[PDB]
Amino acid sequence: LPEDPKWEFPRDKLTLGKPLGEGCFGQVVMAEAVGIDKDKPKEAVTVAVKMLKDDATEKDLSDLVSEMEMMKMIGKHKNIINLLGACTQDGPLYVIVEYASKGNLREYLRARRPPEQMTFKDLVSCTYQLARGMEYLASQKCIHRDLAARNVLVTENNVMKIADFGLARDINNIDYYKKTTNGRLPVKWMAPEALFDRVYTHQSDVWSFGVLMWEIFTLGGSPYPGIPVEELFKLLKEGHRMDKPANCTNELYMMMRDCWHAVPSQRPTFKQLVEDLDRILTLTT
Numbered sequence: 618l619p620e621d622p623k624w625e626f627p628r629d630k631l632t633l634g635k636p637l638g639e640g641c642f643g644q645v646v647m648a649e650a651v652g653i654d655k656d657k658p659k660e661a662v663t664v665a666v667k668m669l670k671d672d673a674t675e676k677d678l679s680d681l682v683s684e685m686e687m688m689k690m691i692g693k694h695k696n697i698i699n700l701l702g703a704c705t706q707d708g709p710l711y712v713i714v715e716y717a718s719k720g721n722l723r724e725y726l727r728a729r730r731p732p733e734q735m736t737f738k739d740l741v742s743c744t745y746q747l748a749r750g751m752e753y754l755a756s757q758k759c760i761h762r763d764l765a766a767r768n769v770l771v772t773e774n775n776v777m778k779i780a781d782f783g784l785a786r787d788i789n790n791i792d793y794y795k796k797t798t799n800g801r802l803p804v805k806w807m808a809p810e811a812l813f814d815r816v817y818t819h820q821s822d823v824w825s826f827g828v829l830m831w832e833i834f835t836l837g838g839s840p841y842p843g844i845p846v847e848e849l850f851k852l853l854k855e856g857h858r859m860d861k862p863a864n865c866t867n868e869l870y871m872m873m874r875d876c877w878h879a880v881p882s883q884r885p886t887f888k889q890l891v892e893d894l895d896r897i898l899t900l901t902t
């Protein structure tokens with residue numbers, strides 16, 4: 618792997634710890650990184666390190682490289698899991714990212730369901746934060762393509778952070794109209810044109826954000842309950858959309874439905890979503 622001194626972090630200053638996440642598609646561990654904050658050269662920072670599993674394939678390696686490279690191009694933002702460094706030379710590839718102690722959002726919400734609970738303000742704030750992260754991502758010309766509650770992480774101070782940039786691309790790096798394009802996107806979060814037309818734009822992410830909203834307001838509900846993946850797209854072509862979640866206003870549901878407009882250009886932009894959610898959150902608070 619080519620040297621990138623700006624991002625390179627010393628292996629001797631990194632102490633690997635306990636496993637994080639389910640570990641299906643990569644190996645992620647908690648770690649202590651000494652001096653990773655360059656203003657505090659002697660302070661250990663609790664980080665997350667992504668690396669290859671023992672059963673990794675050649676494609677796993679080139680995917681992990683591409684994910685790291687993608688995260689290099691995305692500047693710092695509070696509502697995004699940011700790259701902190703990498704160990705690339707003379708050993709196994711470690712991709713060092715921000716640690717979020719409270720795990721993924723789906724589990725986070727499911728665990729605080731009533732049999733401290735989420736308030737309505739908590740849920741709108743969560744939605745607002747993610748709209749902001751996605752607004753920033755889109756401004757960086759990045760399409761995420763895998764927006765979902767499982768791919769949002771939450772910190773100790775309850776900050777929502779978009780994670781998992783394995784499917785993320787620069788907007789110009791999509792092989793348009795090729796039958797393989799978007800073949801690896803989870804179908805239940807996926808805009809119809811991503812499959813039907815083999816394209817992916819920022820407006821495709823907007824659809825997924827609608828799904829994510831539904832997840833949030835159902836406190837980690839599973840989309841399209843009782844509908845198998847195999848029959849979803851016929852139903853979507855026929856105009857099927859998910860019903861309003863109980864603990865969510867008509868206004869917020871109308872926002873979800875807007876996100877699920879059949880016509881991509883008729884969906885809101887992330888900019889507009891941020892503005893509307895800002896207004897709602899302000900009035901709620």
Ligand SMILES: Nc1ncc2c(n1)-c1ccccc1[C@H](c1ccccc1)C2
Nearest residue numbers: 637638645665667714716717720780781
């Ligand atoms: N609790 C927790 N904090 C941080 C991460 C993960 N889990 C986690 C758990 C499983 C998979 C991924 C991740 C995250 C990730 C994001 C982007 C690149 C590399 C790692 C890092």
